Request: fold
Amino acid sequence: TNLSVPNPLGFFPDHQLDPAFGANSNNPDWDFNPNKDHWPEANKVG
Amino acid sequence: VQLQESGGGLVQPGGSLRLSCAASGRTISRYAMSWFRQAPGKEREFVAVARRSGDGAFYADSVQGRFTVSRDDAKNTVYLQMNSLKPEDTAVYYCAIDSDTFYSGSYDYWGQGTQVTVSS
Amino acid sequence: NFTLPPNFGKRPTDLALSVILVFMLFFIMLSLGCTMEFSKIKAHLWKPKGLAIALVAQYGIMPLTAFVLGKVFRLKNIEALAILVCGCSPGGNLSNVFSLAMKGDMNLSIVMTTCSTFCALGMMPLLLYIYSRGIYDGDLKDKVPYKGIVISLVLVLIPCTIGIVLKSKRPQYMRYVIKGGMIIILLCSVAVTVLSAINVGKSIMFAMTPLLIATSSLMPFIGFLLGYVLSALFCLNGRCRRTVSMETGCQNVQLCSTILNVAFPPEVIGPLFFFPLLYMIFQLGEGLLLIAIFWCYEKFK
Amino acid sequence: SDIQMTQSPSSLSASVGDRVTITCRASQSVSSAVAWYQQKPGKAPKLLIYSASSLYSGVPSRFSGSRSGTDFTLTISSLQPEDFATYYCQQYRYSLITFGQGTKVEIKRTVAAPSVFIFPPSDSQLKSGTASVVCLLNNFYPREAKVQWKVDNALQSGNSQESVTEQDSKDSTYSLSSTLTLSKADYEKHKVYACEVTHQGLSSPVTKSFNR
Amino acid sequence: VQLVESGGGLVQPGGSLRLSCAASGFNVSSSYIHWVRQAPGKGLEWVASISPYYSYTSYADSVKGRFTISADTSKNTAYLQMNSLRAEDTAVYYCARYQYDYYYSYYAGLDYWGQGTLVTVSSASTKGPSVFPLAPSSKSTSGGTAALGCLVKDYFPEPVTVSWNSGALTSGVHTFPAVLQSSGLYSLSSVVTVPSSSLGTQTYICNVNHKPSNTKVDKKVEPK
Reply:
């Protein structure tokens, strides 16, 4: 569920080798994972 | 599919009994059984129904508070445990199994039944 | 209590930066295509002795260093997971520049980066599943950009091949091409620094926790040191050792940023949205520092 | 991609003062992020338990929560007359929140056989151009009945509708009416109409018929 | 603290409707507002969510690309906008908050729900009900129990009231829920029981009302 075309000289999600450059614009179709994870075990050192 | 009913006899009023019926046809899990009393030459009446595993143990109105019904998943056997018998309970107790998964009431296969008479 | 500036990712400045970076990549690859030769690349691929060492060094040092730094500094689960994801990532294509500035074997820098971004397809989910146990109880195997990795590999190899054929066939324009490449790279770098500064604004002050800075500054230096030491253990000739060191140290940072955003919502990530930037701005600093140290040593030797 | 829930007991029936255990099972590890709601009929849902083990403020002490790996349970220490409602199971540790099927706790009593009646279509409706035949099931407690329509020893399908009233306030018994709607030609072509209703308390199905 | 919904009504298929959630007692700029839909006679379903502080928005699988949820921190409201409403979207819509737990840092139960606004989509129009009396049979379980009935048919608007003898008959009166026909209208049935003593030697008539129209039909059910 990830078809992003990564750019080696990149540090942000919207740095991709897509000539259309749709990631920077609206409706960016590069992450087909609407069911994200809000997991509560993200502040625990363990 | 076929089944036979064990138990059956004459007891003093206020006694107890273990009217039971095994199942020689197939497994009874995913199915249900019930018991039917047959008044001599009068009618067929409903006394108790055994639902699926851990779902319900509904009884009739006259026998409520006295009778008890249990089922055996492993042995495919149900038991009609009675308590505080009365002369009004004199009947030939019949058996049936529900052929529907949703407890519709489609009692397909019946049984021969055993004659139970309360002797005072 | 952390929120990015409004309409992040869609304002014109971010588009300008994301278009400038592509020209950076194209002209850097074209310039590097004026150093490599096809026959030597074939020789380095048909006699794999430094390539296997580079693969072993990267995939046995960087993930383990990330795991140990996570378990030692007593980081949160999300921070340790981000570090681990940023460790298993491929070598990237800054290693070619850093191995050019240190008189390395350029032909082998292309074998190690193309092969270690094609082995990444197989060994990134495997290492994630091996190491993430006890940190994240979920699936991170369907969020790795496999098609993206392959497309990026081909699209990165195209300009380098163009440069290679240009050097092989028509060397008349090579000096003009390399001068234009250098001047364009310099101009685009001056553009990128100021554009990134304006884009980030004041939101980076929330992503400078001492643990984050310490780990993001200790990971690349440890990678450099351990890559050099392990390559020297196999008695390499002094140039392959520096290339292996500067390919083990540098990482393809964008993969971590595109995996974290796919897997987690903007509120769980928090300040870790900027961690790839910290890794990039510390690895650039350490590479420049090591280049200066190496040239000062070479002057006296 | 949604995280399904498999709330096991569908229509659990327990009288006053018994123990009720409703089990919700997640298809994926949702950590401790399950909440239990109690939606009474005709009103907005309330919150009972959050994080699958805590207790929302104001809820009485009868309810409780548990978690065993991916299996979540809700326990009622002692049923009360206001505890008969529908209970749902929720999830938090994923963006797409998924509820549960629902468990309806209803009062329990002795089994009562249904009373079956039939009604031929009226003359005014007949001249209107439609013929609707209604069969009524009156005052039967165990709400599990199958109604089959028969004409000339033939069985219909896809042309009848049925509606069941809720539990009675005093008798605590149900009521079901099944309606058969036919065109004029179909109604006039056939001769006899009969209904076949099956129930647990009935040894053999009772068939009520009328002749035009 | 309370949430209030508005904007529920009748929408033709393919139309668009806007639902507002006038949150009061807190600020939507930080809360986590949800929309929960309950189909008529079905379990709860999820629709869409908004997190205005992070501007993170997620929709369910069934309404992905047709529903749009917004927040208005200026007016303290949450809007759900729908397009191309299929006939299966008729339901009741609830607005729900998101409790935050401080002892264990994560979200808790959706504490506060609004009353809910009924959104019904259908291409039909308002029509008065038709009353077809159900004549009791002369021989229908003869004895102490005789069954009457009075069926109302072909009315679109959902609300409808039925009573017998203007509320003087409340013994064994059953009012079945209205059932949606395939034609797009509604049909309801009312049944009463009598001691069968010559049908109680009294006049039995329906009292059916319909507010979305002007209809009051008093049909006298007579034995056949």
Q: What stands out?
A: Residues 41 and 61 of chain C are 26 Å apart (CA to CA). Residues 12-300 of chain C form a domain with the Na+/H+ antiporter like fold fold (CATH 1.20.1530.20). Chain C touches chain E at residues 3, 265-267 (CB under 8 Å).
